[PDB]
Amino acid sequence: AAKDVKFGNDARVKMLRGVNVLADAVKVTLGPKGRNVVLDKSFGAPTITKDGVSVAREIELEDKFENMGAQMVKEVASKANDAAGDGTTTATVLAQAIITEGLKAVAAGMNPMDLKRGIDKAVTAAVEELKALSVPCSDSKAIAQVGTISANSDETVGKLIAEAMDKVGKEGVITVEDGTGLQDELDVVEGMQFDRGYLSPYFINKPETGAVELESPFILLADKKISNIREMLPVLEAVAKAGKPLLIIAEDVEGEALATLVVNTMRGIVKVAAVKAPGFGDRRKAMLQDIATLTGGTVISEEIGMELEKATLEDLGQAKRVVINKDTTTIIDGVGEEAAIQGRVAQIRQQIEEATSDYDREKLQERVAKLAGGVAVIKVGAATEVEMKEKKARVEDALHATRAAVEEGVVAGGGVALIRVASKLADLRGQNEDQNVGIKVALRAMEAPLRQIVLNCGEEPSVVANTVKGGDGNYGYNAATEEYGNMIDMGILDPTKVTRSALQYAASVAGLMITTECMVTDL
Amino acid sequence: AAKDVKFGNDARVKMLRGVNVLADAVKVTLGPKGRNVVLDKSFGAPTITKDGVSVAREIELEDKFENMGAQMVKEVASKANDAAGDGTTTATVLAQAIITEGLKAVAAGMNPMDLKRGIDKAVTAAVEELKALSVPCSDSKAIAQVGTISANSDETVGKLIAEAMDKVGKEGVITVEDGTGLQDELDVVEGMQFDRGYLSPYFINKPETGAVELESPFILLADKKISNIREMLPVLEAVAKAGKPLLIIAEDVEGEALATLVVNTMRGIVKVAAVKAPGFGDRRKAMLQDIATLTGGTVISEEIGMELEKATLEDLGQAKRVVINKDTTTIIDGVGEEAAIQGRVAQIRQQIEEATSDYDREKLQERVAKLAGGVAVIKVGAATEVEMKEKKARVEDALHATRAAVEEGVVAGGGVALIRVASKLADLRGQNEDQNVGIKVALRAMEAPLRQIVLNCGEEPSVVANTVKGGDGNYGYNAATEEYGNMIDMGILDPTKVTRSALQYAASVAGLMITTECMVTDL
Amino acid sequence: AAKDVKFGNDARVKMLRGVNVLADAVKVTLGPKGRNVVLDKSFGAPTITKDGVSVAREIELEDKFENMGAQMVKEVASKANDAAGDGTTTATVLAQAIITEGLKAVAAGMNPMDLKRGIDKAVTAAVEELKALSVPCSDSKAIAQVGTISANSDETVGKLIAEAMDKVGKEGVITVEDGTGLQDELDVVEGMQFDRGYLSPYFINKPETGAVELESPFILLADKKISNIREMLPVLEAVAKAGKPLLIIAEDVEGEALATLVVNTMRGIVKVAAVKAPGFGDRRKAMLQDIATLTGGTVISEEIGMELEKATLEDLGQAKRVVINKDTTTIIDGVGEEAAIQGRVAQIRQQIEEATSDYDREKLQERVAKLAGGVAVIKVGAATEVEMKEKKARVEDALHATRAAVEEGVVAGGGVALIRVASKLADLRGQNEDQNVGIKVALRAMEAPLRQIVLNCGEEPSVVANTVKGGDGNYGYNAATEEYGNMIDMGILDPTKVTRSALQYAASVAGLMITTECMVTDL
Ligand SMILES: Nc1ncnc2c1ncn2[C@@H]1O[C@H](COP(=O)(O)OP(=O)(O)OP(=O)(O)O)[C@@H](O)[C@H]1O
Ligand SMILES: Nc1ncnc2c1ncn2[C@@H]1O[C@H](COP(=O)(O)OP(=O)(O)OP(=O)(O)O)[C@@H](O)[C@H]1O
Ligand SMILES: Nc1ncnc2c1ncn2[C@@H]1O[C@H](COP(=O)(O)OP(=O)(O)OP(=O)(O)O)[C@@H](O)[C@H]1O
Ligand SMILES: [K+]
Ligand SMILES: [K+]
Ligand SMILES: [K+]
Ligand SMILES: [Mg+2]
Ligand SMILES: [Mg+2]
Ligand SMILES: [Mg+2]
The missing domain is CATH 3.30.260.10 (TCP-1-like chaperonin intermediate domain)
Structure with a gap:
């Protein structure tokens, strides 16, 4: 439709206002003294959460340019959650700090692309230093x-x-x-776990966690690929009568003739999902056999000649709970038979004692570890x-x-690790002066997590930041006990991956956003 | 859509306003002098109720932040009703008192997370003291x-x-x-009763009680699940001839080919429901046989060879009233032969006289108790x-x-038990000062039920609360006769589970609610 | 008319909002790095001012309760300007800090009257410590x-x-x-100067400084007070033809028959003013004679018999510039005669050498000092x-x-003196806990001037405040050169009266304001 187009400082301040709305809502949750956020849900009671990504996902603004900034910075929390599952509030705080300082540098006439290059160089150096002091x-x-x-x-x-x-x-x-x-x-x-995801985006259950849950489900296994619908249609009726949701572990499933028909069949009473099969060839068949033995089921095959038309409910597997996610799908509790499970474990151990191929050895070790x-x-x-x-x-x-x-x-928590890496990068320089200012912007933003943690405690962020910067090593500020000391000794440890990922995603998005001169949205 | 976002005291006062609206409507009903509430029903006449959860479920506010507060607090009454089926007004009163005092403490600069921790510690201690006092x-x-x-x-x-x-x-x-x-x-x-629920969320009848009633229904029994639903289709039409609701007790029944098709078939004139069967294997078959004998029906099986295609209405079971709930499904008056029931009871008693396995012993004792x-x-x-x-x-x-x-x-009624446990917890302390303030908040809120009871009588709650607190044991205030005395002697007894559950649910929700700094809703 | 009435926290936040609007506009001007405020004038060009009282006088809000708060704090700048003519921004900053902290203490449930008493005790102690530190x-x-x-x-x-x-x-x-x-x-x-003011408030010229100006004025002197109007009407006509503005110095003149008549006579072409004469009896006559000799005029008297009807333009005195203020009226430059001035000075010195009375001695010494x-x-x-x-x-x-x-x-500038006296008053205690919290509020608010000075520099106020508090004596922060050092050595000196008055007026008004629970205004 017709577009509203904004330029320069007007677009930048509207985008910053949206970023600030999202980041304030997210940052009220940072640290031990961080508070909670109530998110209104269209279904049921509101959600009380201290999770930054949950607050970020729920933010959307009436103003379109402010909403544009909010969505762009919400990408930071989304990526941090996808990568590390933690540090989304820290990533949002860092992104807001980089945005604010970089827009201040842009208002000082500096080239925003050189600022972005300086920010990127500083963040690469800081990731290296985080690895070093991890x-x-x-x-x-x-x-x-x-x-x-x-x-x-x-x-x-x-x-x-x-x-x-x-x-x-x-x-x-x-x-x-x-x-x-x-x-x-x-x-x-x-239970069993394989790194595979659902093949249909509409399979997502009522919870918005992105993963579906099946309570006491029915496990179906097949290494070959079936063509005709009527071959396994009686099996579909048997599944519809077993009372337990169906999870199919096959090589790959489409949605043109299977998911579309079943979604036109139901109104959502029963959640039927299909997953991919890790590996291929002999490995796929052997994993399918292991899963069937764990759940008490059977695997069809062309060589065996067993057809699904003769399959019964007792022949197929059964479990107690299955969680299907895009990254990883886990069959939590499959009844099967304990003696059968032990026998299969012993057989796989004997196979380890027999085979000698390196790839086969590592896959068999993975199998026994999983079992x-x-x-x-x-x-x-x-x-x-x-x-x-x-x-x-x-x-x-x-x-x-x-x-x-x-x-x-791990690294020192409470934003101390970012403070230390920023201190170690005081002599980092870029190609020109705008790159140096971008580096300084990134280094100053590296203090923002600690400062926001201190603000949430009601203390003065500048004093605590200066005291921490005056220290060395893992010296920092326990915000829970409101006192300084060794962060490692006091047990305030942050995963190095979480800190590094938060910095990287905040930097990428925020450096991109400071380089924007025009914004095009709907009126 | 676009989101209104509120922070700090503005969000907190809007949340508290919604809490107060819901809790005032609920609390007018507390105690012997509590009054009734008329709830307008879209269907039929308005409902007059003294039940706190019924009033709570009906509250929804035009203001979105006030509505969020109301929904969060309404969760308290919902949980109290689900757990104890009583004390929902007490739970709402306690939740409102905790929220009010905790928000006052938050306005005093106290860290709300530590207030929540103190509230939780005090409520755990009070649950222990209620168990001791019970x-x-x-x-x-x-x-x-x-x-x-x-x-x-x-x-x-x-x-x-x-x-x-x-x-x-x-x-x-x-x-x-x-x-x-x-x-x-x-x-x-x-009759008979088994702890199983309906398998379809859309199975709820016209009344919103959550349990469905079948009047002179038709009981169908099966221990095995056939593949296709077209095989029993003649049995379905035979049921459709006789105007008796079809309750099918089986191992488990899905809904994507039976419930969805039956929903698309009928518009809701006469209803059909499916339920699980208690136990598994031999236990499930024995339970199905007992139910069939009670209702005069028969149980199909693979070993017997009796197919549903040859089943008749006379062969199938029949009852007079069945109440199906998620927690427990009960057949009130199964229409079966009295002599057959007595003979089955005698045979089962002989089974106790023969069996010796401990699990079999306890299951047979449960069977004879139920029969x-x-x-x-x-x-x-x-x-x-x-x-x-x-x-x-x-x-x-x-x-x-x-x-x-x-x-x-049981414990002393009229809020006396909570008063006594709060008095016993006067020396309870937390890790810091904010936790101690949270403990004091919980202890002061423990007086709220008695104070609201006394308010509903038109008396002065502070004077009665002080007189009760000056006493000891089960000394309290009969609000019906408006005089003090031993609450046990005057028969004012509260179940310990009801009091404990009201306190626990009020505490959980209210402690989470005082920790909120931001609220996100639709505009 | 109809009144809007607000209570409690709603009234308090409205009042604080008005205070904040006024104080933010005033406080942007504080310190060497303070900026200017443009005030719109109904007459002519806007005025650019770094003066806190000028900004404060111009602030009036649409919201009536916020306007009430703004007017109450504007009283602080007005009193500081009237007393010391400087430090109005500091007084406004201190008042805002006291109000903010005191309202926070009130929101913590504390008694605002005891907070006010504690604030007053702390401010009395701080005035004493400023006197000692001066x-x-x-x-x-x-x-x-x-x-x-x-x-x-x-x-x-x-x-x-x-x-x-x-x-x-x-x-x-x-x-x-x-x-x-x-x-x-x-x-x-x-020239000459007498601590006297104008007898009519309508004499104020178009400039709003409160002091009227007469360019090349005509000085009239009289000691005896005649009754009728027609007696000096020829003198008034002589002045009206003279062309130079009239300044009469006499004992005392009302406005029933003179000020009202002269106001109705003209529309504001040339201003005519009347003022009191210092002293009484012989002292008044001697002062009038000295003024007449300075301006070349003559003084009428009953004993002399010199009637006003015989007065001519040459007989009366003349000056070059006259400024009349309520506090003190000064004749800037009167032509008179240099030889006559020297002769009168010598005569008064001889009178000193002759007389011996202590009051006469001191008045004659004052006369010769002024001359x-x-x-x-x-x-x-x-x-x-x-x-x-x-x-x-x-x-x-x-x-x-x-x-x-x-x-x-003088004391150390840059807010250092208030910081030092607050440090010295760390062990000051009141009658109860609310008084102690009021004392702490006053002590924390006495840091506000330095913190706002540092904020105007773009530095971190908490870090500089901590560094100054860690120092001793006159050690403080030169905000112009942005470095620490001895405030006296770098020449950053504040008058002790200015600092003390700012604190006293801020304290009085802010302590009164934190005690308000209800506000009544127009709708
Ligand atoms: N006692 C403590 N003292 C100081 N810092 C602490 C303390 N406990 C935790 N932190 C720090 O607080 C941060 C974690 O806060 P929070 O969990 O709210 O945010 P997050 O991990 O960035 O995001 P998310 O909401 O996705 O979990 C980390 O930097 C952690 O080291
Ligand atoms: N005669 C009485 N004197 C004093 N207290 C009484 C008397 N009768 C009942 N109570 C008290 O009143 C409370 C019961 O009130 P009410 O039944 O209206 O609410 P509730 O139990 O909290 O919840 P619900 O609305 O779900 O029933 C209990 O605390 C009970 O001990
Ligand atoms: N170079 C400096 N370094 C530090 N503080 C300074 C410096 N110069 C002035 N100050 C301080 O700034 C304050 C004066 O600010 P400013 O004159 O704007 O406001 P004011 O005196 O409160 O009021 P007004 O607006 O009526 O003059 C004093 O506290 C003074 O000591
Ligand atoms: K968080
Ligand atoms: K009730
Ligand atoms: K100023
Ligand atoms: Mg975290
Ligand atoms: Mg009850
Ligand atoms: Mg000044």
């Missing part, structure tokens, strides 16, 4: 502390994540689920649904933070 | 008094509930249904429909309260 | 530095004021008036009228500040 979470062994910090100083959540990592392994699969009591529970049970470790389910204890959603979000944040910590390491 | 309802033997208090001092309702618990046992199943006369009736008849106890139906007597709805709500409250009393115990 | 400007001898600081670091203005004080004495009268060139001129000329010192005139040099008004305001501020400095002493 400390492995195996050496530090503070997975509980990382989980506690990421769960808003909830020591019980961090202890639970630490116990789950001690039980199913630091790389084992852990899933956060809604509990039934008022207490958080940890249950290590038998022996099982899954660990953390049931969130909460008296109400709003408390359940809040605590589950915090536990998922702690889970993501602990995974990122054991993957990439 | 007295078993078997020892006290005041089920009639509990039912009388929960029925708004209706001694006839309490006496009826006491007689029903004396006849079918304290754990026997009791259903409240509309009568035909102007007097309340108690009828102990043969011998039967069901007790309370026919609510009322001249008009509005009086019927009001009295039925009160009798359901009394039933829930008596169940909670025989389950978890 | 250093005489005779010992320091930094009148040039005081004038430079008060003229917004205009060293030329401070040097000019210092030269004028060296010439006509520190107590000699100095008048700032518009020049004709682009350079500031200092002219020590013969010998004469007057100093500072001609403000500016190319345009807007620059003229701005520079004249700054020179008048410097003049007032130098007078206050030689009267009451």
